[PDB]
């Protein structure tokens, strides 16, 4: 199976005067590349995929693909939907624009059954010839890809090679790798990056890496080299920032942090996302002071 | 004051035939709803597979609803929500143009807006049209919750926002809402607890069961609004089994299964990622249906 693993970043999407700030987007991708990141995830959850037009969706993927040419860095494009016809289109669309693989979130809101989830991903996987990584985040979608469904899709679809897990369920992560040890379990939850990696996970798709790519990159590769004492020691230092980056709904805290670090010009979201509370703004600022934030 | 749309309302299923919207079955079903005491129809809501319908099919179903309900008392409360505020504003203006009397606007799903964001989201929607706007809170589907304070603030600050459809299994919250803002129109979005919500001051239901048994849901709602709580509770108790079995799998998979079993739609067709039920739930739905008299056309 072709895979995309290692330290990966769910890229924020910076806005300037309500439009996508395309040059800062490219500049941020160069900061990830230069700090040990192995792949970037454009237009994911952290990238406010829900409020981007199809043209901006395309724009961010092509900026990501263009910026990563000549590097080892891959583009794992966000291309998921709660309508299978749309998800197939976004999958074919991300492939036609040079993405190395697609991250495909479980259908949100309309909550399909396991049989429906199977047919959903089977249709997506059969529409492209690039790796497909499942994305399970039940707190956001209202549904759960069961361990059995993930394993069947991994075994039945050639390009489906693993799953982003954002479920705070280390039991499920043991379930997955004990029954199907060939899948690429990817952590979608920064605080438990090390426990997932130490059980056989092969990478992270990180929110914290937007701000601290070098630390998330070092953590993952220490762990992949089975240097678990150095991986756990980075995981332990990151716990405070990992948690505070979710004091409000992601990506509200991480964009707040990027703005506080001077990495983006405007603290702009698209509604229904908005600036954090004045408290949470202050709490994020306080926790940031205990970390060294790389510049450009 | 405030313009309101209340009473017995149906979240219409959207029948498909050969992958297309059966517009001709759609009109027949709406005319079956009218003819059985329903006060309003909800096109392209959650039960209508709004997520897998194109914007053109969105228009088509709203239009059929507006046209089929012309000359009757039945209103059209169109589904017009999105997790992107710019899109929700567009769908709200869009629904007004096709004759909808009001809009049901689901809370932003997936992206979990904060309470502040939810307020600005709905304030933008309400200011874009001059027709009633009903909030829709279903946290099990959206991953977020419109708090009581946010609902009340929205009701008081925007003239088109007049209530909320509650699908949260939280009768405490419904007491919280009507005790602090008793002028609001609390609408039940949970068929099994239709009567408890109505007996606490709720002013209507937006029902899934009403697709199959519109006469029973209509009588239940009207009994309760006329304060005949013994007859309203008696229909609610009779409906409990079908109310639950219609959620043995994710709505609208069971209700469409029942509508097909009742011969009310031609094809048991969904749009992926929705699919036909398991073989066992097909049998369970069929068995529970047996105890109810299902009105025809
Ligand atoms: Mg180069
Ligand atoms: Mg090494
Ligand atoms: Mg320091």
- Closest chain A CA to residue B143: A140
Distance, in Å, from the CA atom of A26 to the CA atom of B253, rounded to the nearest integer, reads: 44
Question: How was this structure obtained?
Answer: X-ray
Enumerate long-range contacts of B182-188, CB under 8 Å, 24 or more apart. B183/B2, B183/B155, B184/B151, B184/B152, B184/B155, B185/B4, B185/B6, B185/B134, B187/B6, B187/B9, B187/B134, B187/B163
Bond prior to A251 in cis (omega within 30° of 0):
yes
Instruction: Give the resolution value in Å.
Output: 2.5
User: Do B22 and B203 touch, CB atoms closer than 8 A?
Assistant: no
> CB distance B141–A142 less than 8 Å?
yes
- Which of B49, B83, B273 is the closest to A50 by Cβ? B83
> CB distance B49–A110 less than 8 Å?
yes
- Is residue B136 flagged as an active site residue? yes
Phi, psi of B203, rounded to the nearest 5 degrees: -115, 15
Distance, in Å, from the CA atom of A257 to the CA atom of A211, rounded to the nearest integer, reads: 7
Distance, in Å, from the CA atom of A148 to the CA atom of A153, rounded to the nearest integer, reads: 9
Give the start-end residues of each E strand in A1-43: 6-10, 15-16, 19-20, 39-41
Token digits of residue A196: 């997932």
What does B74-119 look like in DSSP terms, one character per residue? Answer: -EEEEE---SSHHHHHHHHHHHHHTT-SEEEEEPPPSS---HHHHH
β-bridge mates for residue B206, sequence order: B9
Phi, psi of B79, rounded to the nearest 5 degrees: -65, 125
Nearest Cα neighbor of A148 from A115, A126, A170, A123 is A115
> CB distance B85–A51 less than 8 Å?
yes
For the CA atoms of chain A, what is the radius of gyration? 18
- Which of B112, B120, B249 is the closest to A113 by Cβ? B249
Phi, psi of A211, rounded to the nearest 5 degrees: -90, -40
Cα of B111 to nearest chain A Cα, Å? 7
3-state class (DSSP) for residue A7? strand
3-state secondary structure B262-277: CCCCCCCCCCCCCCCC
Distance, in Å, from the CA atom of A115 to the CA atom of A112, rounded to the nearest integer, reads: 8
Q: Which residues of A touch B49 (CB under 8 A)?
A: 110
A249 at B interface, C-beta within 8 A: yes
β-bridge mates for residue A74, sequence order: A39
Does an H or E element contain A119, and which?
Answer: helix A114-126
Phi, psi of A148, rounded to the nearest 5 degrees: -65, -40
Measure Cα distances from A271 to A264, B125, B190 in Å: 18, 11, 28
Cα of B54 to nearest chain A Cα, Å? 10
Structural domains of chain A, with CATH: 6-288 (3.20.20.70)
B54 at A interface, C-beta within 8 A: no
Q: What share of chain B is helix, strand, coil (3-state, %, to 5)?
A: 45, 15, 40
Interfacial A residues in 88-147 facing B (CB < 8 Å): 105, 107-113, 115-117, 119-120, 123, 139-142
> CB distance B272–A123 less than 8 Å?
yes
Q: Which residues of A touch B113 (CB under 8 A)?
A: 249, 271-274
Distance, in Å, from the CA atom of B167 to the CA atom of A142, rounded to the nearest integer, reads: 14
CB atoms within 10 A of CB A126: 14
Q: Which residues of A touch B275 (CB under 8 A)?
A: 112-113, 115-116, 119
Annotated binding site of A: 46, 205
Please state the length of chain B: 297
Q: Taking each helix axis as running N to C, give the angle between helix A54-67 and helix A22-33, from 0 to 180 degrees, rounded to the nearest 10.
A: 40
- Is residue A255 flagged as an active site residue? no
The burial of B76, by beta-carbon neighbours within 10 Å (0-12 exposed, 13-18 middle, 19 or more buried), is given as buried
Nearest Cα neighbor of B200 from B217, B187, B215, B210 is B187
- Which of B108, B110, B272 is the closest to A120 by Cβ? B272
- How far away, in angstroms, is A293 Cα from ligand 3 center? 8
Q: Which residues of B touch A110 (CB under 8 A)?
A: 46, 49, 51-52, 141, 250, 273-274
Nearest Cα neighbor of B158 from B177, B180, B131 is B131
The residue from A95, A164, A172, A255 that is catalytic is A164
Q: Which residues of A touch B83 (CB under 8 A)?
A: 50-51, 272
- How far away, in angstroms, is A3 Cα from ligand 2 center? 18
- Which of B52, B141, B144 is the closest to A111 by Cβ? B141
Distance, in Å, from the CA atom of A201 to the CA atom of A195, rounded to the nearest integer, reads: 9
User: Do B77 and B206 touch, CB atoms closer than 8 A?
Assistant: yes
Cα of B3 to nearest chain A Cα, Å? 25
């Amino acid at each position: 199976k072709n895979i995309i693993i290692g330290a990966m970043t769910a890229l924020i999407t910076p806005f300037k005067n309500g439009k996508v700030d395309e040059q800062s987007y490219a500049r941020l991708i160069k900061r990830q590349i230069e700090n040990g990141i192995d792949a970037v995830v454009p237009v994911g959850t952290t990238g406010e995929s829900a409020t981007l037009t199809h043209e901006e969706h395309r724009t961010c993927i092509e900026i990501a693909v263009e910026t990563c040419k000549g590097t080892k860095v891959k583009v794992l494009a966000g291309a998921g939907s709660n309508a299978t016809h749309d998800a197939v289109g976004l999958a074919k669309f991300a492939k036609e624009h040079g993405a190395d693989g697609i991250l495909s979130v479980a259908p949100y809101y309309n909550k399909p059954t396991q049989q429906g989830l199977y047919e959903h991903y089977k249709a997506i996987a059969q529409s492209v010839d690039i790796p497909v990584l499942l994305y399970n985040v039940p707190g956001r979608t209202g549904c759960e890809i069961s361990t059995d469904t993930i394993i069947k899709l991994f075994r039945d679809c050639e390009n489906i090679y693993g799953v982003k897990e954002a479920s705070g369920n280390i039991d499920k992560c043991v379930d997955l790798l004990a029954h199907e040890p060939r899948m690429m379990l990817i952590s979608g939850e920064d605080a438990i990056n090390y426990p997932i990696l130490s059980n056989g996970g092969k990478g992270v798709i990180s929110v914290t890496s937007n701000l601290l790519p070098d630390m998330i990159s070092a953590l993952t590769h220490f762990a992949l080299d089975e240097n678990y004492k150095e991986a756990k020691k980075i995981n332990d230092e990151l716990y405070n920032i990992n948690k505070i980056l979710f004091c409000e709904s992601n990506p509200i805290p991480i964009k707040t942090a990027m703005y506080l670090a001077g990495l983006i010009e405007s603290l702009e979201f698209r509604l229904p996302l908005c600036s954090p509370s004045k408290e949470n703004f202050a709490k994020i600022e306080e926790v940031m002071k205990k970390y060294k934030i790389k510049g450009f």
